[PDB]
């Protein structure tokens, strides 16, 4: 029980900050996650032998795609770590256990393609899950990996505690379906404005947890500009590959995914910051004031993209 993971001094300090980048050393990411689980939850909440075997199986089931890869998984878990650590008293023991695992697992077996491409291609997953197609798949993979021998990190929970944490993880992963974000944030905005938002209402907590998941998932837009700018290339490498696969089905893709419309990317990032990212972090800051650094960093990057359009970079 007395085996703490310890990071070098720079990582030890910077990991606490929202804008931390986990770096290019793949073989440190597992240690970074255990470090975060230990400080966020405790050295007791998981058996190290079981947790380690879980992490390496989750890693194994993330594919070698430009963006929706193992680094994204650990990056998204890190943002959730920063929210939980800056909102210490707001979250139950089970929520802190569930949400870090939810984030690591949230894009399991992603192929780099949108729900929309699966439906137009007529992928079997689109027949199995008619909405939130990949997100239902991501949760399915999480449960399958949990059920490998020696992988059940929750085995010391009671039957109802166990059912609760898997329900937290299912809702958390489903929430990362950006199609569901818009309505979720609109409702949270209304509940915040009318003052009907009550964190003792479970259906309200679910909504707040969904928004935290959108916030952690989109967190590449809350990094220092060089990280944000370099991550955008990975994001657009997948979009443009999807664009290519659409043209192969005889469909003109939306411009975001057309590599011929590469010039339009700076304006499309403005739309994304204005339509999705800024509203997300605004409502999260209203509900959880200590996540304001995510909004401030997001606004700085909007400004950086405006400077790109105005020819200044």
Ligand X SMILES: O=c1ccn(-c2cccc(OC(F)(F)F)c2)nc1-c1ccnn1-c1cccc(F)c1
Q: Is 107 in the site for Mg ion (CB under 5 A)?
A: yes
| Phi-psi map region of 312: left, alpha, beta (phi>0 left; psi -120 to 50 alpha) | alpha
Q: How far apart are the first and last CA of the chain?
A: 51
List contacts with Zn ion (CB under 5 A). 107, 217
Please check if 122 is assigned to a binding site: no
Helix (H, G, I), strand (E, B) or coil at 127: helix
Taking the CA atoms of 152, 203, 286 and 232 in sequence, report the sign of the dihedral they define. Answer: positive
Say if residue 78 carries a ligand binding annotation: no
Q: How far is the CB of 105 from Mg ion (least distance, A)?
A: 11
Q: Which stretch in 42-50, 91-99, 197-205, 272-280 sits in contact with ligand X by CB under 6 A?
A: 272-280
Task: Please state, in angstroms and rounded to a whole number, the distance separating the CA atoms of residues 169 and 197.
Answer: 22
Structure tokens belonging to residue 117: 């491409």
Query: Which lies closer to Mg ion via its Cβ, residue 103 or residue 232?
Result: 103
Q: What is the distance between the alpha carbons of residues 120 and 102, in angstroms, rounded to a whole number?
A: 28
For Mg ion, the closer of residues 133 and 176 by Cβ is 176
**Could you confirm whether 110 is annotated as catalytic?**
no
Is residue 14 within 8 A of residue 20, CB to CB? The reply is yes
DSSP 45: S
Query: Distance (Å, rounded) from C-alpha 221 to C-alpha 272?
Result: 10
Q: Nearer to ligand X by C-beta: 157 or 178? A: 178
Q: How many residues bind ligand X (CB under 6 A)?
A: 10
Indicate whether 178 belongs to the interface with ligand X (CB under 6 A). yes
Of 52, 237, 276, 302, the one binding ligand X (CB under 6 A) is 276
Burial 150-164, CB ≥16 within 10 A → b, else e: ebbbbeebeeeebeb
Q: Which of 143, 275, 303, 313 is in the footprint of ligand X by CB under 6 A? A: 275
What's the distance, CA 213 to chain centroid?
6
Among 46, 70, 139, 272, binds ligand X (CB under 6 A): 272
Q: Which of 68, 78, 138, 151 is catalytic?
A: 68
Segment lying near ligand X (by CB under 6 A), choices 11-19, 41-49, 188-196, 214-222: 214-222
Question: Which residue of 37, 41, 58, 221 would you call a contact of ligand X, by CB under 6 A?
Answer: 221
Rounded Cα–Cα distance for residues 78 and 17 (Å)? 9
Q: How far, in Å, CA of 88 to CA of 71, rounded?
A: 26
Closest CB to Mg ion among residues 95, 217? 217
Asked if residue 106 belongs to a known ligand binding site, the reply is yes
Among 48-56, 176-184, 256-264, 305-313, which window interacts with Mg ion (CB under 5 A)? 176-184
CA atoms of 200 and 4, how far apart (whole Å): 34
The single residue among 136, 142, 220, 301 that binds ligand X, judged by CB under 6 A, is 220
Cα distance between residue 270 and residue 304, in whole Å: 10
93 belongs to an annotated ligand binding site: no
Cα–Cα distance measured from residue 199 to residue 30, given in angstroms and rounded to the nearest whole number = 32
Could you tell me the smallest distance in angstroms from the CB atom of residue 67 to ligand X? Answer: 7
The least distance separating ligand X from the CB of residue 28, rounded to whole angstroms, comes to: 23
Residue nearest to ligand X according to CB distances in the complex:
272
Task: State the catalytic residues.
Answer: 68
Contacts with Mg ion by CB under 5 A lie at 107, 176
Contacts with ligand X by CB under 6 A lie at 178, 218, 220-221, 235, 256, 269, 272, 275-276
């Amino acid at each position: 029980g007395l085996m703490q993971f310890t990071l070098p001094v720079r990582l030890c300090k910077e990991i606490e900050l929202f804008h931390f980048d986990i770096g290019p050393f793949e073989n440190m990411w597992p240690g970074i996650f255990v470090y975060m689980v230990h400080r966020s939850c405790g050295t007791s909440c998981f058996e190290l032998e079981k947790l380690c075997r879980f992490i390496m199986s989750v890693k194994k089931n993330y594919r070698r795609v430009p963006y929706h890869n193992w680094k994204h998984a650990v990056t998204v878990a890190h943002c959730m770590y920063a929210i939980l650590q800056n909102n210490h008293t707001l979250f139950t023991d089970l929520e802190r256990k569930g949400l870090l695992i939810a984030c690591l697992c949230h894009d399991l077996d992603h192929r780099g393609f949108s729900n929309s491409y699966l439906q137009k291609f007529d992928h079997p997953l689109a027949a199995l899950y008619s909405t939130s197609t990949m997100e239902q798949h991501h949760f399915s993979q999480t449960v399958s990996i949990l059920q490998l021998e020696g992988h059940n990190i929750f085995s010391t929970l009671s039957s109802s505690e166990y059912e609760q944490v898997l329900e937290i993880i299912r809702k958390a992963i489903i929430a990362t379906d950006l199609a569901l974000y818009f309505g979720n944030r609109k409702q949270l905005e209304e509940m915040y404005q009318t003052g009907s938002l009550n964190l003792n209402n479970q259906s309200h907590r679910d909504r707040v947890i969904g928004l935290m998941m959108t916030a952690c998932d989109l967190c590449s837009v809350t990094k220092l500009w060089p990280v944000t700018k370099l991550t955008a290339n990975d994001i657009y490498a997948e979009f443009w590959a999807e664009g290519d696969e659409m043209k192969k089905l005889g469909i003109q893709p939306i411009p975001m995914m057309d590599r011929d419309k590469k010039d339009e990317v700076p304006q499309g990032q403005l739309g994304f910051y204005n339509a999705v990212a800024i509203p997300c972090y605004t409502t999260l800051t209203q509900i959880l004031p200590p996540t304001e650094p995510l909004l401030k960093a997001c606004r700085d990057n909007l400004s950086q993209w405006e400077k790109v359009i105005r020819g200044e970079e």
